[PDB]
Enzyme design. Structure first.
Site, PDB file in Angstrom:
ATOM      1  N   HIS A  68       0.855  -1.337  -0.005  1.00 12.48           N
ATOM      2  CA  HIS A  68       0.006   0.015  -0.226  1.00 12.48           C
ATOM      3  C   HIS A  68       0.943   1.372   0.166  1.00 12.48           C
ATOM      4  CE1 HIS A  68       0.305  -0.002   4.481  1.00 12.48           C
ATOM      5  NE2 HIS A  68       0.365   1.125   4.372  1.00 12.48           N
ATOM      6  N   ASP A  92       0.329  -7.774   1.500  1.00 12.70           N
ATOM      7  CA  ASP A  92       0.635  -6.129   1.689  1.00 12.70           C
ATOM      8  C   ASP A  92       2.111  -6.086   1.701  1.00 12.70           C
ATOM      9  OD1 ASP A  92       0.329  -3.356   1.385  1.00 12.70           O
ATOM     10  OD2 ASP A  92      -0.114  -3.177   3.599  1.00 12.70           O
ATOM     11  N   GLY A 148       2.828   6.749   8.704  1.00 14.18           N
ATOM     12  CA  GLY A 148       4.203   6.989   7.965  1.00 14.18           C
ATOM     13  C   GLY A 148       5.223   5.688   8.463  1.00 14.18           C
ATOM     14  N   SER A 150       4.548   2.391   8.460  1.00 17.06           N
ATOM     15  CA  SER A 150       4.589   1.018   7.779  1.00 17.06           C
ATOM     16  C   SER A 150       5.699   0.763   7.106  1.00 17.06           C
ATOM     17  CB  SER A 150       3.181   1.115   7.032  1.00 17.06           C
ATOM     18  OG  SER A 150       3.497   1.945   5.822  1.00 17.06           O
TER      19      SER A 150
HETATM   20  C1  LIG Z   1      -7.707   2.188   9.966  1.00 11.25           C
HETATM   21  C2  LIG Z   1      -6.411   2.069   9.255  1.00 11.25           C
HETATM   22  C3  LIG Z   1      -5.335   2.436  10.598  1.00 11.25           C
HETATM   23  C4  LIG Z   1      -5.992   3.135   8.438  1.00 11.25           C
HETATM   24  C5  LIG Z   1      -6.199   0.760   8.770  1.00 11.25           C
HETATM   25  N1  LIG Z   1      -6.073  -0.265   9.554  1.00 11.25           N
HETATM   26  C6  LIG Z   1      -6.957  -1.548   9.247  1.00 11.25           C
HETATM   27  O1  LIG Z   1      -6.878  -1.787   8.134  1.00 11.25           O
HETATM   28  O2  LIG Z   1      -7.041  -2.308  10.172  1.00 11.25           O
HETATM   29  C7  LIG Z   1      -7.597  -3.909   9.572  1.00 11.25           C
HETATM   30  C8  LIG Z   1      -7.878  -4.573  10.803  1.00 11.25           C
HETATM   31  C9  LIG Z   1      -6.724  -5.165  11.505  1.00 11.25           C
HETATM   32  C10 LIG Z   1      -5.622  -4.956  10.331  1.00 11.25           C
HETATM   33  C11 LIG Z   1      -6.234  -4.436   9.408  1.00 11.25           C
HETATM   34  O3  LIG Z   1      -6.673  -5.498   8.393  1.00 11.25           O
HETATM   35  C12 LIG Z   1      -6.658  -5.271   7.067  1.00 11.25           C
HETATM   36  C13 LIG Z   1      -5.375  -5.271   6.253  1.00 11.25           C
HETATM   37  C14 LIG Z   1      -5.032  -3.874   5.582  1.00 11.25           C
HETATM   38  C15 LIG Z   1      -3.474  -3.689   4.931  1.00 11.25           C
HETATM   39  F1  LIG Z   1      -2.880  -2.988   5.950  1.00 11.25           F
HETATM   40  F2  LIG Z   1      -2.979  -4.993   4.802  1.00 11.25           F
HETATM   41  C16 LIG Z   1      -3.807  -3.303   3.567  1.00 11.25           C
HETATM   42  N2  LIG Z   1      -3.240  -4.027   2.367  1.00 11.25           N
HETATM   43  C17 LIG Z   1      -3.497  -3.392   1.045  1.00 11.25           C
HETATM   44  C18 LIG Z   1      -3.181  -4.004  -0.200  1.00 11.25           C
HETATM   45  C19 LIG Z   1      -3.327  -3.424  -1.227  1.00 11.25           C
HETATM   46  C20 LIG Z   1      -3.746  -2.115  -1.415  1.00 11.25           C
HETATM   47  C21 LIG Z   1      -3.923  -1.400  -0.369  1.00 11.25           C
HETATM   48  C22 LIG Z   1      -4.018  -2.045   0.915  1.00 11.25           C
HETATM   49  N3  LIG Z   1      -4.478  -1.232   2.052  1.00 11.25           N
HETATM   50  C23 LIG Z   1      -4.192  -1.863   3.497  1.00 11.25           C
HETATM   51  O4  LIG Z   1      -4.305  -1.054   4.855  1.00 11.25           O
HETATM   52  C24 LIG Z   1      -4.533   0.262   4.571  1.00 11.25           C
HETATM   53  C25 LIG Z   1      -3.277   0.754   4.812  1.00 11.25           C
HETATM   54  C26 LIG Z   1      -2.844   0.654   6.115  1.00 11.25           C
HETATM   55  C27 LIG Z   1      -2.059   1.526   6.954  1.00 11.25           C
HETATM   56  O5  LIG Z   1      -2.610   2.717   7.212  1.00 11.25           O
HETATM   57  N4  LIG Z   1      -0.727   1.215   7.688  1.00 11.25           N
HETATM   58  C28 LIG Z   1      -0.080   2.109   8.797  1.00 11.25           C
HETATM   59  C29 LIG Z   1       0.655   3.255   8.213  1.00 11.25           C
HETATM   60  O6  LIG Z   1       1.412   3.928   8.722  1.00 11.25           O
HETATM   61  N5  LIG Z   1       0.529   3.390   6.769  1.00 11.25           N
HETATM   62  S1  LIG Z   1       1.436   4.872   5.998  1.00 11.25           S
HETATM   63  O7  LIG Z   1       2.885   4.544   6.284  1.00 11.25           O
HETATM   64  O8  LIG Z   1       1.241   5.912   6.682  1.00 11.25           O
HETATM   65  C30 LIG Z   1       0.803   5.201   4.385  1.00 11.25           C
HETATM   66  C31 LIG Z   1      -0.567   5.320   4.087  1.00 11.25           C
HETATM   67  C32 LIG Z   1       1.797   5.575   3.414  1.00 11.25           C
HETATM   68  C33 LIG Z   1       1.831   4.169   3.196  1.00 11.25           C
HETATM   69  C34 LIG Z   1       0.814   1.176   9.787  1.00 11.25           C
HETATM   70  C35 LIG Z   1      -0.541   2.033  10.107  1.00 11.25           C
HETATM   71  C36 LIG Z   1      -0.652   3.171  10.897  1.00 11.25           C
HETATM   72  F3  LIG Z   1      -1.356   4.175  10.500  1.00 11.25           F
HETATM   73  F4  LIG Z   1      -0.877   3.101  12.145  1.00 11.25           F
HETATM   74  N6  LIG Z   1      -4.191   0.751   6.799  1.00 11.25           N
HETATM   75  C37 LIG Z   1      -5.429   0.931   5.663  1.00 11.25           C
HETATM   76  C38 LIG Z   1      -4.702   0.614   8.114  1.00 11.25           C
HETATM   77  O9  LIG Z   1      -3.731   0.430   9.032  1.00 11.25           O
END
Ligand SMILES: CC(C)(C)[C@@H]1NC(=O)O[C@@H]2CCC[C@H]2OC/C=C/C(F)(F)c2nc3ccccc3nc2O[C@@H]2C[C@@H](C(=O)N[C@]3(C(=O)NS(=O)(=O)C4(C)CC4)C[C@H]3C(F)F)N(C2)C1=O
Ligand SMILES: [Zn+2]
Length: 192
Positions: A68, A92, A148, A150
């Site tokens: 993502h 992911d 940010g 991840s």
């Molecule tokens: C509500 C919430 C917190 C936003 C969301 N929670 C959530 O989904 O909870 C469910 C229930 C328990 C685990 C999860 O199961 C589903 C798994 C989702 C996934 F992650 F596997 C994922 N597979 C994808 C594959 C292809 C395309 C898009 C995808 N999109 C995904 O998820 C999305 C992204 C992920 C995210 O924000 N990660 C973080 C982060 O910092 N990102 S980031 O670097 O700033 C940035 C956006 C620049 C890259 C670490 C968490 C931080 F913010 F704490 N998400 C949404 C979340 O965490």
């Protein structure tokens, strides 16, 4: 465009800190070109696209990060950008060959449930492992503080990597647990 290394975190030794390597203009230019003049140092790299910023963790000679964040994009390199040797949307997970200077972290096998996340700002955030891919925060904290980070490492007390930060369990702006890609998943990864 390209994924660009705009910084690094070295974890060996003292209390770690983040080191910036590029700015906005230089990161845009390097995402356009694909040629990275800077050297790679550290086990955790700060990665950026033209729109998003996140982390990558070096394990087993490979820089791993979240789909993502990076999608299917390439990673800027010395001469030319590096192609992804691993891509798995279901997990992911994506992975590029680690270039020279990237130090790999050793996988954790101690079975310790006392983990901590290292954030993009090098903060340590402890969490208690309660399953294969989840760890409960010792104190809930606003979700914005985890954004940010991840692709950042979930570590054991020994300094070995138990997992790669993927998602958070959050409600109404407050995170309560971390969800990560277990480290055992990165060794059983198909070099596509
Ligand atoms: C509500 C919430 C917190 C936003 C969301 N929670 C959530 O989904 O909870 C469910 C229930 C328990 C685990 C999860 O199961 C589903 C798994 C989702 C996934 F992650 F596997 C994922 N597979 C994808 C594959 C292809 C395309 C898009 C995808 N999109 C995904 O998820 C999305 C992204 C992920 C995210 O924000 N990660 C973080 C982060 O910092 N990102 S980031 O670097 O700033 C940035 C956006 C620049 C890259 C670490 C968490 C931080 F913010 F704490 N998400 C949404 C979340 O965490
Ligand atoms: Zn361990």
């Amino acid at each position: 465009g390209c994924v660009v290394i705009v910084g690094r975190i070295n974890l060996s030794g003292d209390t770690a800190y983040a080191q910036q390597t590029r700015g906005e203009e230089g990161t845009q230019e390097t995402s356009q070109t694909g040629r990275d003049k800077n050297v790679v140092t550290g086990e955790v790299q700060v990665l950026s696209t033209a729109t998003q910023t996140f982390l990558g963790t070096t394990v087993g000679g490979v820089i791993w990060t979240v789909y993502h964040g990076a999608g299917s994009r390439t990673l800027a390199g010395a001469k030319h950008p590096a192609l992804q040797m691993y891509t798995n949307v279901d997990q992911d997970l994506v992975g590029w060959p680690a270039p020279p200077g990237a130090k790999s972290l050793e996988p954790c096998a101690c079975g310790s449930s006392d983990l901590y996340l290292v954030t993009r700002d090098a903060d340590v955030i402890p969490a208690r492992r309660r399953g294969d891919s989840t760890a409960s925060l010792l104190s809930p904290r606003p979700l914005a503080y985890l954004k940010g980070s991840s692709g950042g490492p979930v570590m054991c007390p020994s300094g070995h990597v138990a997992g790669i930060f993927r998602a958070a369990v959050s409600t109404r702006g407050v995170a309560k647990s971390l969800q990560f890609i277990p480290v055992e998943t990165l060794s059983t990864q198909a070099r596509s």
